Scaffold this motif. Structure first.
Motif, PDB file in Angstrom:
ATOM      1  N   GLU C  49     -26.294 -13.671  10.198  1.00 31.72           N
ATOM      2  CA  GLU C  49     -25.474 -12.504  10.488  1.00 31.72           C
ATOM      3  C   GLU C  49     -25.997 -11.315   9.686  1.00 31.72           C
ATOM      4  O   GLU C  49     -26.297 -11.448   8.501  1.00 31.72           O
ATOM      5  CB  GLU C  49     -24.002 -12.794  10.187  1.00 31.72           C
ATOM      6  N   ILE C  50     -26.084 -10.158  10.353  1.00 31.00           N
ATOM      7  CA  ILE C  50     -26.596  -8.925   9.775  1.00 31.00           C
ATOM      8  C   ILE C  50     -25.414  -8.129   9.220  1.00 31.00           C
ATOM      9  O   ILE C  50     -24.381  -8.011   9.879  1.00 31.00           O
ATOM     10  CB  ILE C  50     -27.434  -8.141  10.813  1.00 31.00           C
ATOM     11  N   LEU C  51     -25.587  -7.589   8.005  1.00 30.55           N
ATOM     12  CA  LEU C  51     -24.500  -7.002   7.235  1.00 30.55           C
ATOM     13  C   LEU C  51     -24.644  -5.484   7.124  1.00 30.55           C
ATOM     14  O   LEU C  51     -23.651  -4.797   6.884  1.00 30.55           O
ATOM     15  CB  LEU C  51     -24.456  -7.660   5.851  1.00 30.55           C
ATOM     16  N   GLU C  52     -25.870  -4.969   7.289  1.00 26.41           N
ATOM     17  CA  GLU C  52     -26.152  -3.560   7.043  1.00 26.41           C
ATOM     18  C   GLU C  52     -26.838  -2.915   8.246  1.00 26.41           C
ATOM     19  O   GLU C  52     -27.513  -3.587   9.024  1.00 26.41           O
ATOM     20  CB  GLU C  52     -26.999  -3.381   5.780  1.00 26.41           C
ATOM     21  N   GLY C  53     -26.651  -1.593   8.362  1.00 25.02           N
ATOM     22  CA  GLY C  53     -27.299  -0.761   9.364  1.00 25.02           C
ATOM     23  C   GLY C  53     -26.698  -0.952  10.753  1.00 25.02           C
ATOM     24  O   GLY C  53     -25.570  -1.427  10.887  1.00 25.02           O
ATOM     25  N   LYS C  54     -27.473  -0.559  11.773  1.00 28.88           N
ATOM     26  CA  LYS C  54     -27.129  -0.773  13.169  1.00 28.88           C
ATOM     27  C   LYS C  54     -27.096  -2.275  13.446  1.00 28.88           C
ATOM     28  O   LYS C  54     -27.901  -3.026  12.895  1.00 28.88           O
ATOM     29  CB  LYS C  54     -28.136  -0.057  14.077  1.00 28.88           C
ATOM     30  N   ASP C  55     -26.140  -2.682  14.293  1.00 29.97           N
ATOM     31  CA  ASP C  55     -25.923  -4.058  14.719  1.00 29.97           C
ATOM     32  C   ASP C  55     -25.364  -4.902  13.571  1.00 29.97           C
ATOM     33  O   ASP C  55     -25.620  -6.104  13.500  1.00 29.97           O
ATOM     34  CB  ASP C  55     -27.159  -4.670  15.398  1.00 29.97           C
ATOM     35  N   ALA C  56     -24.582  -4.261  12.691  1.00 28.21           N
ATOM     36  CA  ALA C  56     -23.920  -4.938  11.585  1.00 28.21           C
ATOM     37  C   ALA C  56     -22.784  -5.810  12.114  1.00 28.21           C
ATOM     38  O   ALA C  56     -22.099  -5.437  13.067  1.00 28.21           O
ATOM     39  CB  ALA C  56     -23.421  -3.931  10.578  1.00 28.21           C
ATOM     40  N   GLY C  57     -22.608  -6.977  11.481  1.00 26.23           N
ATOM     41  CA  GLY C  57     -21.585  -7.945  11.844  1.00 26.23           C
ATOM     42  C   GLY C  57     -21.927  -8.712  13.120  1.00 26.23           C
ATOM     43  O   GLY C  57     -21.039  -9.272  13.760  1.00 26.23           O
ATOM     44  N   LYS C  58     -23.221  -8.732  13.466  1.00 23.83           N
ATOM     45  CA  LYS C  58     -23.713  -9.391  14.666  1.00 23.83           C
ATOM     46  C   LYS C  58     -24.674 -10.511  14.273  1.00 23.83           C
ATOM     47  O   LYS C  58     -25.398 -10.398  13.283  1.00 23.83           O
ATOM     48  CB  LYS C  58     -24.359  -8.372  15.611  1.00 23.83           C
ATOM     49  N   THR C  93     -44.222   2.094  29.068  1.00 17.65           N
ATOM     50  CA  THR C  93     -43.094   1.195  29.259  1.00 17.65           C
ATOM     51  C   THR C  93     -42.299   1.109  27.959  1.00 17.65           C
ATOM     52  O   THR C  93     -42.866   0.830  26.904  1.00 17.65           O
ATOM     53  CB  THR C  93     -43.571  -0.188  29.727  1.00 17.65           C
ATOM     54  N   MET C  94     -40.984   1.346  28.055  1.00 17.42           N
ATOM     55  CA  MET C  94     -40.090   1.271  26.909  1.00 17.42           C
ATOM     56  C   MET C  94     -39.785  -0.192  26.596  1.00 17.42           C
ATOM     57  O   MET C  94     -39.538  -0.991  27.500  1.00 17.42           O
ATOM     58  CB  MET C  94     -38.791   2.045  27.160  1.00 17.42           C
ATOM     59  N   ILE C  95     -39.816  -0.515  25.296  1.00 12.98           N
ATOM     60  CA  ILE C  95     -39.645  -1.859  24.766  1.00 12.98           C
ATOM     61  C   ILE C  95     -38.744  -1.773  23.535  1.00 12.98           C
ATOM     62  O   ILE C  95     -38.960  -0.918  22.676  1.00 12.98           O
ATOM     63  CB  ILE C  95     -41.021  -2.484  24.429  1.00 12.98           C
ATOM     64  N   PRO C  96     -37.704  -2.636  23.408  1.00 12.09           N
ATOM     65  CA  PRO C  96     -36.961  -2.769  22.155  1.00 12.09           C
ATOM     66  C   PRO C  96     -37.789  -3.561  21.148  1.00 12.09           C
ATOM     67  O   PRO C  96     -38.218  -4.679  21.434  1.00 12.09           O
ATOM     68  CB  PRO C  96     -35.697  -3.555  22.544  1.00 12.09           C
ATOM     69  N   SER C  97     -38.018  -2.956  19.977  1.00  9.20           N
ATOM     70  CA  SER C  97     -38.750  -3.593  18.895  1.00  9.20           C
ATOM     71  C   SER C  97     -37.862  -3.699  17.660  1.00  9.20           C
ATOM     72  O   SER C  97     -37.214  -2.729  17.269  1.00  9.20           O
ATOM     73  CB  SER C  97     -40.037  -2.866  18.602  1.00  9.20           C
ATOM     74  N   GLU C  98     -37.851  -4.895  17.062  1.00  7.39           N
ATOM     75  CA  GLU C  98     -36.985  -5.211  15.938  1.00  7.39           C
ATOM     76  C   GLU C  98     -37.544  -4.580  14.666  1.00  7.39           C
ATOM     77  O   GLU C  98     -38.759  -4.483  14.497  1.00  7.39           O
ATOM     78  CB  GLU C  98     -36.840  -6.726  15.763  1.00  7.39           C
ATOM     79  N   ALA C  99     -36.630  -4.140  13.794  1.00  4.37           N
ATOM     80  CA  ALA C  99     -36.958  -3.703  12.448  1.00  4.37           C
ATOM     81  C   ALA C  99     -36.718  -4.860  11.482  1.00  4.37           C
ATOM     82  O   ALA C  99     -35.712  -5.559  11.602  1.00  4.37           O
ATOM     83  CB  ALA C  99     -36.129  -2.496  12.080  1.00  4.37           C
ATOM     84  N   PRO C 100     -37.628  -5.110  10.508  1.00  2.00           N
ATOM     85  CA  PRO C 100     -37.434  -6.180   9.527  1.00  2.00           C
ATOM     86  C   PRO C 100     -36.232  -5.916   8.623  1.00  2.00           C
ATOM     87  O   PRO C 100     -35.895  -4.764   8.355  1.00  2.00           O
ATOM     88  CB  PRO C 100     -38.737  -6.167   8.714  1.00  2.00           C
ATOM     89  N   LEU C 101     -35.592  -7.003   8.179  1.00  3.24           N
ATOM     90  CA  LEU C 101     -34.428  -6.938   7.312  1.00  3.24           C
ATOM     91  C   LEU C 101     -34.695  -7.750   6.048  1.00  3.24           C
ATOM     92  O   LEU C 101     -35.292  -8.823   6.108  1.00  3.24           O
ATOM     93  CB  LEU C 101     -33.211  -7.493   8.058  1.00  3.24           C
ATOM     94  N   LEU C 102     -34.226  -7.218   4.913  1.00  6.78           N
ATOM     95  CA  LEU C 102     -34.311  -7.897   3.630  1.00  6.78           C
ATOM     96  C   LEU C 102     -33.298  -9.040   3.598  1.00  6.78           C
ATOM     97  O   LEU C 102     -32.309  -9.017   4.330  1.00  6.78           O
ATOM     98  CB  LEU C 102     -34.062  -6.886   2.505  1.00  6.78           C
ATOM     99  N   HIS C 103     -33.563 -10.029   2.735  1.00  7.76           N
ATOM    100  CA  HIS C 103     -32.786 -11.258   2.647  1.00  7.76           C
ATOM    101  C   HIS C 103     -31.346 -10.981   2.217  1.00  7.76           C
ATOM    102  O   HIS C 103     -30.450 -11.754   2.547  1.00  7.76           O
ATOM    103  CB  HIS C 103     -33.481 -12.270   1.725  1.00  7.76           C
ATOM    104  N   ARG C 104     -31.138  -9.882   1.479  1.00  7.13           N
ATOM    105  CA  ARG C 104     -29.812  -9.488   1.028  1.00  7.13           C
ATOM    106  C   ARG C 104     -29.024  -8.854   2.175  1.00  7.13           C
ATOM    107  O   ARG C 104     -27.795  -8.888   2.167  1.00  7.13           O
ATOM    108  CB  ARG C 104     -29.886  -8.599  -0.220  1.00  7.13           C
ATOM    109  N   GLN C 105     -29.745  -8.293   3.157  1.00 10.07           N
ATOM    110  CA  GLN C 105     -29.148  -7.577   4.277  1.00 10.07           C
ATOM    111  C   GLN C 105     -28.627  -8.553   5.332  1.00 10.07           C
ATOM    112  O   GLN C 105     -27.925  -8.144   6.257  1.00 10.07           O
ATOM    113  CB  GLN C 105     -30.139  -6.579   4.881  1.00 10.07           C
ATOM    114  N   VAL C 106     -28.979  -9.837   5.187  1.00  8.96           N
ATOM    115  CA  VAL C 106     -28.548 -10.884   6.104  1.00  8.96           C
ATOM    116  C   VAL C 106     -27.882 -12.010   5.312  1.00  8.96           C
ATOM    117  O   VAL C 106     -28.046 -12.103   4.096  1.00  8.96           O
ATOM    118  CB  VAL C 106     -29.706 -11.410   6.978  1.00  8.96           C
ATOM    119  N   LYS C 107     -27.132 -12.859   6.028  1.00  8.28           N
ATOM    120  CA  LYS C 107     -26.467 -14.013   5.445  1.00  8.28           C
ATOM    121  C   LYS C 107     -26.502 -15.174   6.436  1.00  8.28           C
ATOM    122  O   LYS C 107     -26.323 -14.970   7.636  1.00  8.28           O
ATOM    123  CB  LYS C 107     -25.026 -13.658   5.064  1.00  8.28           C
TER     124      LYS C 107
END
Ligand SMILES: [Mg+2]
Ligand SMILES: [Mg+2]
Ligand SMILES: [Mg+2]
Ligand SMILES: [Mg+2]
Ligand SMILES: [Mg+2]
Ligand SMILES: [Mg+2]
Ligand SMILES: [Mg+2]
Ligand SMILES: [Mg+2]
Ligand SMILES: [Mg+2]
Ligand SMILES: [Mg+2]
Ligand SMILES: [Mg+2]
Ligand SMILES: [Mg+2]
Ligand SMILES: [Mg+2]
Ligand SMILES: [Mg+2]
Ligand SMILES: [Mg+2]
Ligand SMILES: [Mg+2]
Ligand SMILES: [Mg+2]
Ligand SMILES: [Mg+2]
Ligand SMILES: [Mg+2]
Ligand SMILES: [Mg+2]
Ligand SMILES: [Mg+2]
Ligand SMILES: [Mg+2]
Ligand SMILES: [Mg+2]
Ligand SMILES: [Mg+2]
Lengths: 176, 45, 202, 97, 41, 26, 139, 220, 123
Positions: C49-58, C93-107
């Motif tokens: 689960e992502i805790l910070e930024g866009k798409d938090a709590g997902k 062509t438009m593509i969604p590309s993921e941004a990396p997250l730090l280990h503290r930013q996820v659980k």
RNA sequence: CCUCCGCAUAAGCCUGCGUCAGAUACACUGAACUGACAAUUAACAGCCCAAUAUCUACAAUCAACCAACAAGUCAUUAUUACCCUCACUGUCAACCCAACACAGGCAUGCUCAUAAGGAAAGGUUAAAAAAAGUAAAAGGAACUCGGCAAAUCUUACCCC
RNA sequence: GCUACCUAAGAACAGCUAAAAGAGCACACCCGUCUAUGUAGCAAAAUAGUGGGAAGAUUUAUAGGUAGAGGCGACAAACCUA
RNA sequence: GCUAAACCUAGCCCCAAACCCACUCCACCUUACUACCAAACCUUAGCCAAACCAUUUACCCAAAUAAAGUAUAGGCGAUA
């Protein structure tokens, strides 16, 4: 024959050739010496074939069909070599108790550093050998100062490295 | 006209400034030692 | 790899990495929290689960882990949009590309509760090492992810140059006090009557 | 133009870290502790500089005397030359004589 | 460089402001500006 | 890069004035 | 074999044997026209023509009539970003003429994207009569 | 008597100007280009069952209202150029189509009363092209009045008139990625009918250049 | 005047160029009139086995299970080479000290064609 | 139209105008620039030799006359020992020493003007001054420190 | 590895006149008389013409030697890496 | 508005502590990095100061301080 320097004709231009796993040390340990001998030559033929292909790929300005299998064969023969060497070493320890296959001795060079001199094969004994006698296995007093300077140089480098580590740690403690 | 003092010769080069020539005298040994200390890539010709 | 090499999203050996990190460049190094190999608790194919930024709590599955940067990539989450295949005459062509997250930013998320949980490396009397939640004492199993080359072992057909399992696992080695040389000399019936003469080693 | 176009990152100083909070403690070790220890003993630094003060030349002589034997060759040579130079400067040069 | 002047720009500008209306390199170059400004004053 | 704050601050103030003079607010 | 000590020979001593040979060979296509019998190889430096004859006769069971070797100098002209010379390796080239009238020629080896293709064919390049106006709107 | 010349170091004059593959990670796609079955302007049941089983709670009857809201909101945020909201409301396929030309110009799109309520015409689903990827497409007919004004960089009007409303009939296909949580219905494509009336003429007069010919080339 | 480049047989004058080599091992000697004599025994002989009916192949099936890595040691070799024989002799019959030669031990390497120390064989 | 140069060896240098693809001290979007690919194959040359005694007065010069002086550039035998062969290395170029793609320096053989190798003029105009040439009425050193330079090709002296 | 001198074993010198030579004319080769050009030059000493020598106390390639309180010198205080 | 300007961190410095380095294989004193044949110990001088210079002119030697710049030495000068 010469066709052995090339893979199967059907495999030419396939863009991908499926290969099994590389040999491991334990698997090869299960094999006998004569079996390892035969497998050595099998793998050797394979390496020659793949190296031929690699060079031809470079010539044609095309990617190699499967570069990974070359790596496999290389590490396989490395593993085989290790196994055979282990057996030789073990038997040597039993019979002679010698850790090294080739004889040698610790010597001082002219520059004062202690080096492991590896012995060479000669027909005549050492005292009669002109070229060997020319070579000096001792340092005169004039060297000692330089040795000290070298030591200091080492220490200086070591000191810097150690100190740098400490600094970095502090930065981390400041950041977190 | 000057500036063409260097008239190259491999025999002369190796005889004068070679490894064996350097080790022949204690002075030359110290020369190699100095260069090793400075960390020179090229100790001799 | 050069000292103070900047680890990126693209793999180090890639063309893109070579463009981003040529040999000459020397950028300010990234300060990374020192996490031990054992302390690390995030693996590919493990839902977080992502805790910070866009798409938090997902919640989503980790696709790639970069250990050097303390990064986890979560597929389809924390995304920004980029054009691929863009040229002079075409928009791309438009593509969604993921941004990396730090280990503290996820659980890590416990299976049944579907809520983020803190994880410690508790031992087991039977099992080797497991991940146990602080709030509730239950194990989280290691996710199954395809390996580097993606062999898929369950469905593997042997090639013409592949040794069978039976032949590979055969033990034909009889232990003896003879070298490979001596054994092969005996096997092929090569006779060498001439004796080796002593040499001087120095 | 040698002026920065952005403000520097702001300086945060913890005035109440352990080092600052306990600064000066045991400075009066002698007068309040039956003179068992001198305050000079609390000084942590080079062997030659502990509870002693002197000019550049005096400091160099002291360093050579005390840790001279343990010094690196190049460092010792530099110290020798430094003393030699400072000798000439302090004895032979100046305004007042 | 334990101590170095960080305010040199402003020191230059104090002299230069009086030189703006001069012609030639006097108006912008400090070495030349300062001399002309002293004369002006 | 010179250590200090005061000079940088003063220069920020100068640039602010320059921006105001160049583009006056309504 | 390479990078190994060869046991010294004395007159009337035993035959020198290699059980597992260390060196490896790549068969290469010639850059220039060669006779039909000629086969080109890239060879380790430590190898001799005698070794190559024996190698090919032994391992590959190909009859060999003549071997000729040369040493090619790799260019040291190349410079990196540090202006340090980069060495292309020197290699040994061997020309082998086959026996018994056997002829050899080099064989002719080497004889998401869908969505991008779909996007490309659905480009619909802007009409010049539209005069730069966006064509998204239904109006 | 004589002083020898001094050469500069060479480096000073030798200065020069300073100048996806196979991997474990793959590109995650939230959209598929094109339409599975293109609606022909003047099958659905099984497809809507396929949608409903994943959703567990879906109504066709309510969908036109949602579709209308999405459509209007997307077209509205074009005016304020908020791409963040557009991404939520519009499929990644649709985004460049409706954004690329709009750059460096102003849009004054507005919505007025719809003449006829919107209705679903076709329902289709994915045929499992990618593992763990299922896509559901809904086509809706919309007969609405709209206002449009497009200006230049310089604010000079290019296209349409600000006040006057124009009738428009559109087929809008919406795509959703099923099997993916947090997924939502987004405007994917507009289908243009072959029998459609031509768009209103532009104000600008254009020149269509002839074939530019090399001297040796002869005009036909 | 190129210190950094590797010294090679290409580099010197005629004498220099002939004298150096590329590290190929000699297979004979020179004699009067610059005649070269190849000694047959000096030429390495490739011991190539018959590969007909050899079941082993360059790669291994991926279906083959992984095993714990254990390198061979002197202790191990002794345990499954010599230990059964000597233990059999001790338990049943008599074991003779200073008669280890029957168990495969050699006091000296001098007799054998292949000597373990120093090595008298290639690879 | 030039050739006072060329081809080869030695020495030196070390891939430095071969192929393909690219960006881009006159320029060709081509370069000798960048990257990749390819290449110099031994007969020529280098790399030599068992031991112990022992032998070796009489040049070379077309070596024959003749004539020398500075007096010379190349020889074995006896006895013992001796049986395996064609390995290794150089072989490219428009090239080296002169900070440069420098009117300079650079050994030998052959070619003694070429069968080989090259191009003095970016385009224009036809000023002055400057440089190198060609021709010049009548005079012929009157020039000048001095017949310097040029033309002409010269005598008789003095000092050292 | 320039240069001064030496050592070892080498190489080069067309043609013409000459009783025949440290002879003369004169190539190649070595040197540098005089003038002009050049003077950040083609060149940290060159170019063009004109010159001196060109079978010899000649010129020159290779390898070796002599080292600074010194070497080497047909003494110019010459040369010993501009 | 061009050329530009701006930056923070590679690393370093002084201490403290602690006595450092040393084989994958192969090659390396012959022309180093080339498989393989008949001999080291030995006063430093000088710049410099003495306003020249000629005797002389501090330079680590077993750990702080103090005795003490004292006794002494010295063209009894400089200075030690
Ligand atoms: Mg020079
Ligand atoms: Mg010379
Ligand atoms: Mg050859
Ligand atoms: Mg190139
Ligand atoms: Mg020959
Ligand atoms: Mg021609
Ligand atoms: Mg021209
Ligand atoms: Mg012109
Ligand atoms: Mg004129
Ligand atoms: Mg006249
Ligand atoms: Mg007169
Ligand atoms: Mg007259
Ligand atoms: Mg007059
Ligand atoms: Mg005249
Ligand atoms: Mg005339
Ligand atoms: Mg001589
Ligand atoms: Mg003649
Ligand atoms: Mg004469
Ligand atoms: Mg004459
Ligand atoms: Mg002389
Ligand atoms: Mg005189
Ligand atoms: Mg004089
Ligand atoms: Mg000089
Ligand atoms: Mg004095």
């Amino acid at each position: 024959g010469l066709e052995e320097f090339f893979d199967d004709p059907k495999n030419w231009g396939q863009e991908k050739v499926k290969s099994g796993a590389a040999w491991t040390c334990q698997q090869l340990r299960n094999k006998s010496n004569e079996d390892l001998h035969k497998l050595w030559y099998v793998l050797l033929k394979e390496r020659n074939m793949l190296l031929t292909l690699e060079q031809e790929a470079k010539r044609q300005r095309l990617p190699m069909p499967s570069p990974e299998r070359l790596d496999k064969v290389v590490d396989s023969m490395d593993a085989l070599d290790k196994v055979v060497q282990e057996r030789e070493d073990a038997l040597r320890l039993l019979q002679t108790g010698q850790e090294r296959a080739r004889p040698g001795a610790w010597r001082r060079d002219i520059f004062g550093r202690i080096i492991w001199h590896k012995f060479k094969q000669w027909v005549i004994p050492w005292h009669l050998n002109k070229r060997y006698n020319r070579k000096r296995f001792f340092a005169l007093p004039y060297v000692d100062h330089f040795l000290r300077l070298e030591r200091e140089k080492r220490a200086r480098i070591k000191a810097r490295k150690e100190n740098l580590e400490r600094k970095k740690a502090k930065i981390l403690l400041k950041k977190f | 006209a000057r500036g063409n003092e260097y008239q190259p010769s491999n025999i002369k080069r190796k005889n004068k400034h070679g490894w064996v020539r350097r080790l022949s005298t204690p002075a030359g040994v110290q020369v190699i030692l100095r260069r090793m200390l400075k960390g020179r890539k090229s100790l001799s010709h | 790899l050069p000292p103070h090499y900047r680890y990126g999203m693209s793999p180090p050996g890639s063309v893109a990495d070579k463009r981003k990190n040529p040999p000459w460049i020397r950028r300010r190094p990234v300060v990374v929290e020192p996490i031990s190999d054992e302390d690390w608790y995030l693996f590919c194919g493990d839902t977080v689960e992502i805790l910070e930024g866009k798409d938090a709590g997902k919640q989503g599955k980790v696709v790639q882990v970069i250990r050097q940067r303390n990064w986890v990539v979560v597929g389809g989450l924390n995304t920004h949009y980029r054009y691929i295949g863009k040229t002079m005459d075409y928009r791309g062509t438009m593509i969604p590309s993921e941004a990396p997250l730090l280990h503290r930013q996820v659980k890590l998320v416990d299976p049944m509760d579907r809520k983020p949980t803190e994880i410690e490396w508790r031992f087991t009397e039977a099992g080797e090492r497991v991940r146990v939640s602080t709030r509730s004492g239950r194990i989280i199993p290691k996710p199954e992810f395809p390996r580097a080359d993606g062999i898929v072992p369950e469905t593997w057909i042997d090639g013409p140059k592949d040794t069978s399992v039976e032949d590979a696992l055969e033990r034909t080695y009889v232990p003896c006090l003879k070298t490979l040389q001596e054994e092969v000399m005996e096997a092929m019936g090569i006779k060498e009557t001439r004796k080796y003469k002593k040499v001087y080693w120095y | 133009i040698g002026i920065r176009l952005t403000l520097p990152p702001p300086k945060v100083v913890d005035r109440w870290n352990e080092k600052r909070a306990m600064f000066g403690v045991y400075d009066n070790i002698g007068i309040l502790g039956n003179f068992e220890k001198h305050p000079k003993e609390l000084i942590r630094g080079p062997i030659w500089l502990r509870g002693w003060k002197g000019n550049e030349l005096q400091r160099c002589i002291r360093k050579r005397k005390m840790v001279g034997s343990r010094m690196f060759a190049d460092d010792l040579h530099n110290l020798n030359k430094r003393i030699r130079y400072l000798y000439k400067h302090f004895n032979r040069h100046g305004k007042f004589r | 460089l334990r101590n170095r002047v960080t305010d040199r720009y402003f020191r230059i500008q104090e002299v230069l402001k009086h030189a703006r209306h001069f012609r030639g390199r006097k108006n912008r170059c400090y070495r030349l500006a300062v001399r002309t400004v002293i004369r002006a004053f | 890069v010179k250590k200090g704050f005061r000079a940088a601050f003063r220069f920020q103030k100068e640039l602010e004035r320059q921006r105001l003079l160049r583009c006056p607010p309504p | 074999a390479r990078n190994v000590v060869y046991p010294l020979y004395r007159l009337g001593g035993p035959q020198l044997r290699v059980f597992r040979t260390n060196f490896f060979i790549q068969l290469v296509r010639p850059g220039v026209a060669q006779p039909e019998d000629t086969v080109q190889f890239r060879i380790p430096m430590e190898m001799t023509r005698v070794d190559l004859r024996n190698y090919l006769e032994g391992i590959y069971n190909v009859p060999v009539a003549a071997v000729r070797t040369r040493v090619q100098h790799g260019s040291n002209k190349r410079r990196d970003h540090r202006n340090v010379r980069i060495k292309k390796p020197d290699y040994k080239v061997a020309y082998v003429q086959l026996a018994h009238g056997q002829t050899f020629t080099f064989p002719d080896l080497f004889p998401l994207y869908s969505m991008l293709e779909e996007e490309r064919q659905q480009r619909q390049s802007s009409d010049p009569r539209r005069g730069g106006v966006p064509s998204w709107f239904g109006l | 008597r004589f002083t020898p010349p001094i050469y500069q170091p060479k480096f000073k004059t030798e200065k020069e100007f300073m100048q996806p593959e196979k991997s474990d990670r793959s590109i995650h796609l939230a959209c598929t280009a094109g339409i599975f079955d293109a609606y022909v302007p003047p099958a659905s049941q099984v497809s809507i069952r396929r949608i409903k089983d994943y959703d567990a709670n879906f109504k066709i009857k309510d969908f036109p209202e949602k579709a209308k809201d999405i459509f209007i909101e997307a077209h509205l945020c074009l005016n304020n150029s908020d791409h963040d909201r557009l991404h939520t409301l519009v499929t990644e396929h649709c985004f460049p189509d409706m954004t690329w030309d709009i750059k460096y110009k102003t849009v004054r799109w507005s919505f007025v009363e719809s003449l006829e309520p919107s209705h679903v015409v076709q329902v289709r689903c994915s045929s499992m092209m990618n593992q763990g990827n299922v896509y559901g497409q809904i086509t809706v007919r919309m007969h609405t009045r709209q206002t449009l004004a497009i200006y230049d960089r310089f604010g000079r009007l290019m296209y349409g008139q600000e006040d006057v409303p124009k009738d428009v009939l559109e087929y809008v296909v919406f795509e959703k990625q099923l099997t993916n949580p947090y997924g939502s219905w987004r405007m994917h494509t507009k289908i243009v009918p072959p029998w459609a009336p031509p768009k209103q003429p532009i104000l600008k007069t254009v020149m269509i250049p002839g074939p530019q010919l090399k001297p040796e080339e002869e005009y036909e | 005047a190129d210190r950094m480049s590797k010294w090679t047989s290409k580099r010197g004058p005629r004498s220099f160029r002939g004298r150096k080599g590329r590290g190929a091992k000699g297979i004979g000697f020179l004699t009067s009139g610059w005649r070269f004599v190849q000694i047959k025994e000096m030429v390495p002989e490739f011991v190539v086995p018959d590969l007909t009916g050899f079941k082993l192949k360059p790669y291994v099936s991926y279906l083959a299970p992984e095993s714990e890595e254990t390198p061979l040691t002197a202790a191990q070799l002794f345990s499954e080479a010599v230990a059964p024989a000597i233990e059999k002799d001790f338990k049943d019959g008599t074991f003779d000290p200073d008669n280890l030669e029957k168990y495969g031990f050699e006091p000296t390497q001098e007799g054998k064609l292949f000597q373990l120390y120093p090595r008298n064989f290639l690879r």
